[PDB]
Amino acid sequence: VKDTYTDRLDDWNGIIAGNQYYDSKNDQMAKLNQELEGKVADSLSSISSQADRIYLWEKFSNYKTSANLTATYRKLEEMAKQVTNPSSRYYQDETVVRTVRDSMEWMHKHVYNSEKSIVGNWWDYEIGTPRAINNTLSLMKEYFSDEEIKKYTDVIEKFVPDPEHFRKTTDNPFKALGGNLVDMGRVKVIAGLLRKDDQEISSTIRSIEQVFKLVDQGEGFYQDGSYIDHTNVAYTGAYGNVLIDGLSQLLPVIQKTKNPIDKDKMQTMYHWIDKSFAPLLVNGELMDMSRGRSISRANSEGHVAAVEVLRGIHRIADMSEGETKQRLQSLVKTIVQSDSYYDVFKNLKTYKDISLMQSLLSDAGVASVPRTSYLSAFNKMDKTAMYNAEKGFGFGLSLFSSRTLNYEHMNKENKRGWYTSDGMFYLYNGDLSHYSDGYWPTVNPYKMPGTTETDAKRADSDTGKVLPSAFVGTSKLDDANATATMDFTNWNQTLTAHKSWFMLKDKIAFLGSNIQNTSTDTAATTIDQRKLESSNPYKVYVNDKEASLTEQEKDYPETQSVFLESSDSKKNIGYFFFKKSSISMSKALQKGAWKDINEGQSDKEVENEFLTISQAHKQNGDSYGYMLIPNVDRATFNQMIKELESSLIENNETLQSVYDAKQGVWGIVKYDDSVSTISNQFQVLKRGVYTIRKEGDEYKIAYYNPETQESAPDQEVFKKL
Template structure:
């Protein structure tokens, strides 16, 4: 064996799928350095092929019972009567088949059959109580993931949650198959070879275990339900989740290594007082096999990978709780130590997964995922933190500071008006029950738990910021979104704590350069602007598992404008928006295929490893993407854009100047001479606050019939209440196509896992500019939340000058602020404004001071 490692023995039952007379055994050692010795390899006949018949958990009369003082024991033989022998001392009590220890010592039980005949005498030994720390940690885990002890009958939300859980248990008990030979427990989860059905089955048992442990439940300490839970866990581990099982066919590694194990360990934690150590080891054999290493997934497959980010936290929720249940201190320490990598920022300029110091969060290799897998990370870690704090290995100051940084630099800047920006949520945007508002509450849930662990000053500061986001949700909605009494208690206490005031949100600019995103909030005008780009290091979009099938252009320079229309993105935007015309994007006007599993499979057959790229999921060849800022109201961003199939190119930039955002595009070219257009905007209308359109100052009717105008210098969408106005000012007369259309779609079109095929219809105003000539350009300014009077004034002032907009230079002059914003695309020397001599390619911001220009910010790009 290699130095420093331990011997490992594995025995596997090989069952040929077809008639086999030869086999080849290949040994793989792909990770690590040094020498590995494979020894004592043997093949031996195992006998007849194991029966495919379902195995039933058997019950045998106990020969003896050994139990610690803190546990209860449910007798094996439910039809027999157990009683304390006449000569026994006051060591135990027996209540309806449940043995309850009273003191340490030994005693005897008599076992009577249904006719009252004594069939056995069983020795009983009560040992000292288990390690109190282990027991308290398991209790704390149950408190964090449910918190039944926090139940308050005066809370409608808590009462409703308990009723919902009770009703679900009642229904699932009624629907449970009575057929002992059945291959499933519930008919709607009938194919347990499809691993998602296995996970869902285990979650139903977990739900039952929750109610068994909850004082408010009608099933509290229900011995028959406890027996059923244990029997069905045994059934699952005998038939579907055991070391001889392979992850193959319709099975997914996630279910075997995260979904099912989490449900099992949680179930055992809830019924911990009623399970023996022998039973725990039996029920967790599958976990030990499929998840042997707290730092690695797919260990039983040929392509294992390192556990990082949200998946690493999920691993921790499996391995840490498993170790506690099994009283395995070494495994506990190792599983906790495995989490250390979470608290290290990825190096600037690297391409690793995880958090970066600029607030970016990357997952799935190269996808911006703060609002999805980042949510999973802080949600899971925030559940583990209370346990870690009870251990000697509690979180040190550095780790607490890192968690504070995540909250304040990664998550809060992406929250506006109670929403979590969709550009950070990846394929989650296609889930009907996971709107941007719900995603925000999910993130806040983890943030509030983490805040409890922070030093007092940081705790109060962050709670004030959380309270500011919660102000956009009503208390009833907040509490109803929660699935534990523990979380309900935390949120209720915060909302009712008059000593913690909601922190006023000031203007801010967050540049997430490592994930090619930008978020800006203007406090005076109360709007937010978000920009979603991609580069050679980040993916344009991710479609996976039949989700986000039409996310094609969401990373191509799409912008989001958050104003007083709080439901613009959260209220069924994604199934009804035209996915070919995302706001701010420049694209070929071509048909696209929905990126489903079936479509990817077809492409895989044709293109192998290039399948995802052929489906449209790609990085750019260009690294000329990034942003700089000067203060909290001035920024410059650029994307030297090349579309997914390399047929459209454009040089796109955005300049934020306080309450105005300038959009420039140049060198727009189609390699295939297909029609190309830039979507100036595609705005969903609020039926209660619809828009009136003004073109060049004149009110203009807009219908479903496309309106073509070739002389547009200004557009104003004037909302009914005047609070959601949007102005567009063009640098020169521009030809535009405008329409107001009722667009229809359903959730199942963008997420085929959804059963909701109901057609949704919403009105959208679409404004686009067609690029019919080679190396075309566009130039316009977006003015959110501007009154009509102020817009008319801006139109006459011509405050912003576009001095250059070509393939070499994009140059903007803000005369009011004396600012110059420069995008330089090459290394050739350029003299700007007769004064500035620039050589390096990249982004420049200058402020005029007297007769000179002071450089405020620079970022080299190439």
């Protein structure tokens, strides 16, 4: 009742709503206010106003489905925001004030109280709903009595009494870490501020600290930047988001309590941003390979997901000072400005976040220079991110091994992500909307780019698996060159292939050998499946001769090269086959719906055109070998393949190697411990992945053993000839 807790709750309110920063003459703020007003109007004109109703809102009447619980409270929160906004048409409106208060009671008496038990997802009973309830009582604290707040938060205590574990009410609770651990703070630090429970605050804060540590196993952030969740899933771009997004919201309040958090523990926060998040952001897009099952959500495509991270970073920068505040500010500014496809404000949902972004972008003192080149090998989550600032393209390598799950199909989401980690690659170029605009529900799940597979049908009911082999990993020499491999075996053990990738600054070689098939199904590797633009059509050249592609698969034997020519060179893609190969191509309209891959999504039909290139393997001991060259014009491409006409050093069952003469760099993958002499210059001696650079008479070496996850002394793996 107007004490020190209300002081902290006031700060929270300024963070989650920020009504005190509202300015009607502010274009962006007025827009968001227009959105909230419309939400509250729709909730008010559709709410049940009859005697003894059986649902507050019919669209969320089935209180057997966990979602209907927090979606219902989310509506009362939106009302709490407008009722306290002086510029809203619902400011201090008696019907809104009474509706909220009245609605808290009904839900409490008949749907969510202490004498209840989890039904559906636990997430809604412990995180979603409790969060929406906390925010509502905080925003409207001047309309509720302390006793009413106590009474209304008691149920949160029942379901979430332990700030260390979740599902404590059920039979199989679990330890809270990472994203979920941060959501625990949003539930118990606020509920504790509302209930004026000092014990609850200190113990949840004390428990939040756990997040500030790095891990060498299990869930959490690794020192190499990888972030794992759900036991063994690469998840920086989804659960990592929740972590930073939520922690950046809480910190300001936490720090003003009697239990602040050590300035050094937050030193690691800057590490996550620089080592984990930043590399996954390309032209404002958050690489899908790190978003797990969220890739199947229509309203959370790459550019939109990226904004959850950016606003968290922004909030953190604002907490810092001096250089740190400056550098984080420029990181956010340059990324936001490099995004010509998505409007960042479309995902800044509070007035403080909008105000912050505006200050940032209009401040000439904050630098905004193009990000420089970089290559991150997240070996702890079997992902690899590469970015070339000079030519301007990004590249992502999605793998998995015995240490990680290939794909997460859970809660009925991402039903067909079967091959998204079977050596699938991502190419981020001039077309910033490639993986957006319905790419996921329209891409053929059976031909993910870069993957070798049989045409056997797959079931939506299937779920993730780990790889039998641990020989999966990337050897990084510098920020422009690296080598990767995957001792691949498919889902039903009927196909194998030694797949290797050679990232050489401005191109990537794809080598595959030892391809074997014991099934009757047909086997082939998808060189590419690119989503086309009706605006920037491609002129296709095979062997440098114009070709006309059809929906029908056209076969091109003796193919030495394929070139996709756009009017914008930053969208061109070339494929040089080290040895004339038999490939087939087709261009076709592919239709689908989001519901097809996520039960909770829309059934509305979506469609996009895709250009598919693939190579069939009709024999045991088959292989493939091609160089991918993006962002160069036709004439340069033709020039480059002339130089690379001898870049293939080897590609068989025990050794794969490509040589970049212009750079003096070698990419090498050895599957056995025999001695391999390379280019009559040196010898490599151990199973593993190498990336070597000759500098004068000296050699720079980068060796990595994927199985043991260790490097090694040079003399054990390399011998100069």
